[PDB]
Design a protein around this ligand. Structure first.
Ligand SMILES: Cc1sc2c(c1C)C(c1ccc(Cl)cc1)=N[C@@H](CC(=O)NCc1ccc(/C=C/C(=O)NO)cc1)c1nnc(C)n1-2
Length: 126
């Protein structure tokens, strides 16, 4: 069975808007989301439909861009680092579960290259 998805709303979690978080939505997420290779990462891994019964035995901190998108739209984060960590968790999970040269790894690598290029221009905090 699939686990519940990561939370995207929690009144107990401190949060704010920052210009860096705005950039993470308007530049970083938008750039990756529209990419031809985005689709496997646009929602949680459905280990039932994909017949990956071991997925959530290996991947204990799942993350995906659907979750990130909702978190950004909900202003769920306190700082840019929290959101950058979610992106890196997503990429790392893919590399942990899969193997070098797999199609899904090539897709993650293409998205990660753009992620790195955009994060390199993260604005200074206002
Ligand atoms: C909806 C999702 S989420 C997700 C995947 C898919 C289809 C994929 C995946 C996505 C795109 C591509 Cl091109 C190949 C595999 N992988 C699995 C992991 C997975 O099933 N591995 C086995 C697998 C199954 C089918 C193919 C098909 C190739 C093909 O060319 N189809 O004809 C290859 C390996 C995986 N990991 N991390 C993520 C994220 N994924």
């Amino acid at each position: 069975m699939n686990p519940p998805p990561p939370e995207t709303s929690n009144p107990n979690k401190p949060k704010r808007q920052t210009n860096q978080l705005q950039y993470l939505l308007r530049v970083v997420l938008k750039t990756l989301w529209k990419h031809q290779f985005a689709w496997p990462f646009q929602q949680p891994v459905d280990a039932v439909k994909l017949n990956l019964p071991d997925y959530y035995k290996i991947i204990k901190t799942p993350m995906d861009m659907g979750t990130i998108k909702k978190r950004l739209e909900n202003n769920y984060y306190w700082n840019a680092q929290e959101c950058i960590q979610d992106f890196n968790t997503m990429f790392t999970n893919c590399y942990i579960y899969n193997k070098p040269g797999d199609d899904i790894v090539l897709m993650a690598e293409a998205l990660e290259k753009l992620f790195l290029q955009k994060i390199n221009e993260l604005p200074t905090e206002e």
